[PDB]
């Protein structure tokens, strides 16, 4: 009402009931919207984000609509701390999800988790979005097990210099390939490279990637050229997708469309 605009929520509106966990931004809580709605919220703490930068992004960002891309409602902004409103997801984050073993997964389910992921990044492709920081600890899992895409494109309103730099002590090294460990050079290809990193952690069970090494002998490793090798649950057909997202030139990796149909015809071989 007077005057909302069509992106800003009235925090009036909300019940809080339970808290969830902490994150680098702060808490998030689960609560209800208008005494009905299932929602979490996220509570960014003082001096932690550019604010005026990320409020009109949210604008676009309300925009987007994918059925494997986590939901936005909105935001609250005449206010400190401000919010961030979506839709509750039950069974909290993947990699801890991958970890629990009393689930005793089929390879089956695995292939399927990896093609809801390949489909929300496919519809960001097609917008011309980057995710920036995709990894199993940024994806969700709902009452029904199925897996969504979270933080896309939160990475750019952060403040702390430890997550922003390749020098930086809380850079994403173990999901970059070697054009941005060198040069700083961000496209679509750097997604590419991420979702390959993580194929490689689904299948694995949730293990960290290059998990003898630190992040430095790690960027050493990738510009001799080495590479992951095949975790026991994937099948020779399923190696030879996650590979082929880290050539050495970016150029020569597949699109996420190519990589779909990849997924498809794997699916309907094994089963
Ligand atoms: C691995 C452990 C972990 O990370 N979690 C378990 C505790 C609950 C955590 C959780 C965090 N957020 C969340 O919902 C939101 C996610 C993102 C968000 O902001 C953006 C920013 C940019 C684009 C999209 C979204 C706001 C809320 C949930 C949840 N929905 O249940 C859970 C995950």
Redesign the pocket.
């Known amino acids: 009402g007077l005057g909302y605009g069509s992106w800003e929520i009235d925090p009036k509106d909300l019940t809080f009931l339970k808290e969830?966990?902490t994150?680098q931004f702060g808490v998030?809580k689960?609560g209800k919207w208008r005494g009905q709605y299932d929602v979490?919220?996220?509570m960014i703490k003082e001096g932690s984000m550019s604010e005026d930068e990320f409020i009109e992004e949210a604008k676009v960002?309300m925009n987007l609509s994918h059925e494997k891309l986590?939901q936005?409602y909105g935001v609250c902004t005449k206010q400190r701390p401000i919010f961030?409103?979506?839709?509750?997801?039950?069974n909290?984050?993947?990699?801890?999800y991958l970890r629990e073993m009393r689930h005793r997964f089929q390879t089956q389910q695995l292939l399927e988790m990896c093609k809801d992921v390949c489909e929300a990044m496919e519809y960001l492709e097609s917008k011309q979005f980057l995710h920036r920081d995709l990894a199993a600890?940024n994806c969700?899992v709902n009452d029904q097990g199925v897996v969504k895409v979270?933080?896309?494109?939160?990475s750019r309103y952060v403040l702390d210099d430890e997550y922003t730099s390749s020098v930086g002590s809380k850079f994403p090294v173990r999901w970059s390939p070697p054009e941005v460990l060198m040069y700083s050079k961000f496209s679509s290809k750097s997604d590419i490279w991420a979702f390959g990193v993580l194929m490689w952690e689904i299948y694995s069970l949730g293990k960290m990637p290059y998990e003898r090494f630190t992040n430095s002998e790690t960027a050493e490793h990738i510009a001799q050229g080495l590479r992951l090798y095949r975790p026991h649950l994937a099948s020779e057909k399923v190696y030879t997708i996650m590979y082929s997202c880290w050539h050495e030139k970016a150029d020569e990796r597949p699109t996420f469309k190519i990589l779909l149909s990849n997924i498809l015809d794997v699916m309907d071989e094994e089963s």
Do not use: W
């Not at 961030?84 to 039950?90: D, L, Q």
């Not at 909290?92 to 801890?96: K, M, S, T």
């Not at 979270?150 to 939160?154: A, E, K, M």
């Open positions: 969830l966990g994150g998030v689960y979490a919220i996220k960002m986590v936005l961030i409103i979506t839709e509750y997801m039950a909290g984050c993947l990699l801890n600890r969700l979270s933080d896309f494109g939160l």
